[PDB]
Design an enzyme around this catalytic site. Structure first.
Site, short mmCIF file in Angstrom:
data_model
loop_
_atom_site.label_atom_id
_atom_site.label_comp_id
_atom_site.label_asym_id
_atom_site.label_seq_id
_atom_site.Cartn_x
_atom_site.Cartn_y
_atom_site.Cartn_z
N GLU A 56 49.56 54.05 51.82
CA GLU A 56 50.95 54.51 51.91
C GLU A 56 50.91 55.93 52.51
OE1 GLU A 56 51.88 51.04 49.38
OE2 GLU A 56 52.42 51.94 51.30
N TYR A 57 51.90 56.28 53.31
CA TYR A 57 51.89 57.62 53.90
C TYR A 57 52.02 58.68 52.81
CZ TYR A 57 56.90 58.30 53.14
OH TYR A 57 58.14 58.47 52.56
N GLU A 100 51.20 52.96 56.22
CA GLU A 100 52.55 52.42 56.04
C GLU A 100 53.65 53.45 56.27
OE1 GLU A 100 54.02 53.40 52.50
OE2 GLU A 100 55.73 53.41 53.87
N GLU A 105 59.93 53.84 56.49
CA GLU A 105 61.14 54.51 56.95
C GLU A 105 61.56 54.01 58.34
OE1 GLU A 105 57.78 57.46 58.10
OE2 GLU A 105 58.16 55.91 56.59
N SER A 160 58.13 61.42 56.35
CA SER A 160 58.94 60.28 56.78
C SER A 160 60.12 60.77 57.62
CB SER A 160 59.44 59.49 55.57
OG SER A 160 60.20 60.32 54.72
N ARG A 161 60.67 61.94 57.27
CA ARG A 161 61.79 62.49 58.03
C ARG A 161 61.32 62.91 59.42
NH1 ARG A 161 62.21 61.54 52.68
NH2 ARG A 161 61.39 63.62 52.16
#
Length: 290
Positions: free
Chosen positions: A95-96, A122, A125, A169-170
């Site tokens: 997962e990131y 992953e 987003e 993620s942003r």
């Protein structure tokens, strides 16, 4: 009858929320044809979770039936786990963020290549209903300036990483939509005794578009995103959320399985890796500025 399984044996590492989600999804019919859940690794003595048995890390690395490891523990432990499993010859989904260090990420991609393994970071987003909306919106438009701000509750940096990494993620949304970015500035405001902190990053697209990325955390703050994109033809200040992103993690697992089946083009694999490293590189630089 002796039948050699053609399914990939999976071990889930870390059974906090993220790991529990992967365990749940591995039981779904959409996971049945290609994956077989072997067990899970935990730093706690659980023994088992339902019908799923716990396997020690050492045994997991030695297990010949385990072909894949899902690294779902807190981010500060990702680097070590990925390295151990790749060295042991297992494919890895993580997962990131895959690491909290750009150099370490470079090392891991090289190791994965060395061992002929799939390494997948992953990024659900980019699979969000909200992102599909944005993909269509930016298509054929010219960005002049824009801002993306995310607020949330305090996050343990010791375990989850610096804000640029934990909230990568942003940044990923921005790079995916507008391409590689140049870093102009990065500021950090802190008040640990109040558990408050705001990171402000100024970026620039290759088309001279000015982007502001803000991550804010504080006691009581609700998880909200603020989108404000200024285009030459129209403006966007809100993204609708009419669904619940049902099965979004299974969508990510589907991508990983396509990689295991060797059904992803070299160009597609390369483009994803390039974006992933560009983002991790920016996060690293941003942390240095702060």
């Amino acid at each position: 009858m002796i039948t050699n399984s053609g399914k990939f044996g999976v071990v889930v590492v870390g059974v906090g929320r993220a790991g529990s989600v992967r365990l749940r999804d591995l039981k779904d019919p959409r996971s049945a044809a290609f994956l077989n859940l072997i067990g899970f690794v935990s730093r706690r003595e659980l023994g088992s979770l339902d019908e799923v048995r716990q396997i020690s890390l050492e045994d997991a690395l030695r297990s010949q039936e385990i072909d894949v490891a899902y690294i779902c523990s807190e981010s500060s432990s990702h680097e070590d786990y990925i390295r151990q499993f790749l060295q042991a010859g297992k494919h890895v989904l993580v997962e990131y963020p895959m690491t909290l260090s750009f150099a370490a990420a470079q090392e891991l991609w090289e190791l994965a290549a060395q061992k002929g393994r799939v390494l997948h970071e992953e990024h659900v987003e980019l699979l969000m209903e909200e992102f599909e909306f944005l993909r269509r919106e930016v298509l054929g438009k010219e960005l002049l300036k824009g801002s993306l701000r995310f607020t949330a509750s305090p996050l343990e940096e010791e375990r989850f990483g610096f804000p640029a990494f934990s909230g990568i993620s942003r940044l990923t949304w921005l790079v995916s939509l507008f391409g590689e970015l140049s870093l102009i500035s990065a500021t950090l405001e802190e008040r640990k005794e109040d558990q408050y902190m705001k990171m402000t990053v100024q970026l620039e697209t290759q088309n001279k578009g000015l982007l502001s990325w803000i991550e804010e955390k504080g006691p009581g703050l609700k998880r909200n995103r603020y989108v404000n994109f200024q285009f030459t033809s129209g403006s966007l200040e809100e993204v609708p959320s009419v669904g619940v992103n049902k099965n979004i993690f299974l969508k990510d697992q589907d991508i990983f399985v396509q990689k295991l089946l060797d059904q992803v083009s070299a160009e597609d694999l390369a483009a994803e890796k390039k974006r992933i490293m560009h983002c991790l590189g920016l996060a690293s630089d941003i942390q240095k500025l702060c």
